[PDB]
Design a protein around this ligand. Structure first.
Ligand code: 66I
Ligand code: 66I
Lengths: 335, 335
């Protein structure tokens, strides 16, 4: 039975920014927070998705009612990042792999709600609100709201202007108090705080993670897929940006900070007896200090992350080791 | 039983431009043409609406299946020219006054179909097509398609970009072969010819009237309302631009050309015996020649139009002389 103060700590730890602290505290004084996270069903999710999933885990630990939105219409509206025929296959792939990630990090699925955008975003009342919103949002504001999220092409399409407006309306139709996403969503979040009240709807609390550098190319591609075999995880980890003593733009350290510490509350560095043997850290700042002092070597850091990451991936790889899930993976991502 | 050639003449006479003559003739060789005309339910219709209604009459004379669309959602999308609360009152006013105009010029209403946009434009299949269209139409093309139709404001709204796309989709959902409107619709019509095939839908024939100068200020406001009393019709007609011998930008002559000649097939100029007495014209070009020669005086032309216009308005004014229609007129246009 966590106190409102303990819930607030669980909910907001590791975030880059909280908008709406006043209302957030008002809610936690009385009841559970209702929050959602959305993802457009576009490319294959990679290990970076453990970063938002670790905050989802925190939200459930705090007692929140959590909704996960598979934003299939949004994937279509974002420059057809998922063509319309493949959408429902993409939703199935996303649902299976996101549930597998949550099961792997021990998140109880029975208190989560999963919904796909097209379950309600084609309804008459929602569509009427899209038109009501379109009558107050300028073309200027919808273009700028999506600048960091929607793909920016030479001749922008009308769909790209619709995208942020629907993401705002989703807060009302999912009946939430708050929306969580990475800080790349910030301009959509502030757009929603401005325009939802123009429709008679309350502004929501917005919770924003930092954009965490990947476990590969410095801060694009070459990422680690959730279904990569151990040997491919090992190979990709060797090439990760991880300079000795350099605690910035370090995707290996960032994964520890945002995924492994919240999961386990500790992190063990594997190290030879010659250099002091293993050491258990209870706080990220202590590990960071040792890495800056160069008494945690990059190779030992990578070794330690490799062991923990393969533990997270093992049940996922097992789950997708089914004839039906192998066919789904290939069918959702053909050529 | 008019021939295909006689139907084509009735359908296309007095038009400024026909797009799709090849397909138009292919259809008339086999069956009746399916056509619609739409109007956004915004301001009170004035006597200029007799110009499109006279072409509707021609279409029915040619045997066409005609739909009249009361585009209520479009009125809302066009800079809220009709706010959402007043829309259904505006639709009722438009339906009553348009049916009255057609009855006045002797158009049989029983073979016309009347539909309001929100009967189908909020449906799931239509909304899906709006999103499919938005994924191919650029912001650039939708802005330019509506440049002469949608109000151009300093900070354009998203609704204004949606407007031409929905007008294009209306051609498919109303299941027509052709759309009729004034030539101010041309950029929406060519937009529809370009983009409907991107959705797997056929291009439509487009029929365009000329933009006829009003019976008032030269070629805005001061117009004659369909419910104006005889005395107000008389007063407004006195101030109409009608210079002797000047057959251009002459709203009085244009009304004769586009409304009175199609209705009656003749036009009688009322003139004193001293100047030759009355004369009946069987063709507009003969009247124009006499006006250019200054043997039809502006006052006599206005007198002759006044008599005919009050005949067209009399049954409309009688129809709206009901307690329920008086309340409707005031409720749809308050303050
Ligand atoms: N490296 C990282 N570090 C920290 N957070 C990260 C990443 C990362 O990298 C990536 F490559 F995986 N993504 N995320 C976060 O997870 C989510 C990704 O999902 S998304 O598909 O991008 N969704 C969108 O864009 C949203 N508009 C979709 C949407 C649509 C309608 C709604 O009503 C609500 C939402 C967003 O919150 C992202 O910030
Ligand atoms: N002086 C004149 N001479 C000759 N024709 C004239 C005029 C005139 O003057 C005015 F003041 F009355 N209007 N018209 C013509 O009648 C119609 C008016 O209706 S409207 O409300 O303007 N409709 C729109 O704009 C259309 N986008 C509405 C629409 C929406 C969805 C659809 O699927 C189809 C259509 C249009 O065709 C106009 O050209």
């Amino acid at each position: 039975a966590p106190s409102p103060e303990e819930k607030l700590h669980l909910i907001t730890r590791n975030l880059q920014e909280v908008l709406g602290e006043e209302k957030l505290k008002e809610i936690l004084k009385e009841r559970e927070l209702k929050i959602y996270w959305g993802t457009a069903t576009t490319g294959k999710p990679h290990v970076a998705y453990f970063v938002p999933m670790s905050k989802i885990a925190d939200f459930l630990k705090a007692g929140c009612e959590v909704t996960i939105l598979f934003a299939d219409l949004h994937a279509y509206l974002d420059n057809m990042k998922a063509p319309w025929e493949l959408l429902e296959l993409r939703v199935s792939y996303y649902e299976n792999v996101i549930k597998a990630m949550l099961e792997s990090i021990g998140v109880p699925l029975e208190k989560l709600k999963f919904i796909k955008g097209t379950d309600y975003q084609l309804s008459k009342e929602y569509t009427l609100d899209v038109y009501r919103l379109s009558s107050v949002v300028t073309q200027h504001d919808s273009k700028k709201a999506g600048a960091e999220v929607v793909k920016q092409v030479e001749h922008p399409l009308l769909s790209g202007l619709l995208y942020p407006g629907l993401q705002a309306l989703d807060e009302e139709y999912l009946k939430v108090d708050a929306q969580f996403g990475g800080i790349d969503q910030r301009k959509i979040f502030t757009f929603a705080e401005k325009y939802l009240p123009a429709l008679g709807y309350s502004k929501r609390v917005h919770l924003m993670n930092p954009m965490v550098p990947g476990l590969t190319g410095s801060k694009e591609e070459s990422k680690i897929d959730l279904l990569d075999r151990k040997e491919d995880v090992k190979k990709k980890l060797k090439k990760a940006f991880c300079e000795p003593g350099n605690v910035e733009n370090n995707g290996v350290l960032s994964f520890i900070k945002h995924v492994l510490f919240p999961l386990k509350s500790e992190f063990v560095i594997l190290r030879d007896e010659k250099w002091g043997g293993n050491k258990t850290y209870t706080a990220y700042v202590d590990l960071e200090k040792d890495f800056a002092a160069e008494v945690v070597h990059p190779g030992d850091l990578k070794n330690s992350v490799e062991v923990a990451l393969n533990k997270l991936l093992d049940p996922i790889r097992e789950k997708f080791n089914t004839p039906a899930l192998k066919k789904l993976a290939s069918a959702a991502y053909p050529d």
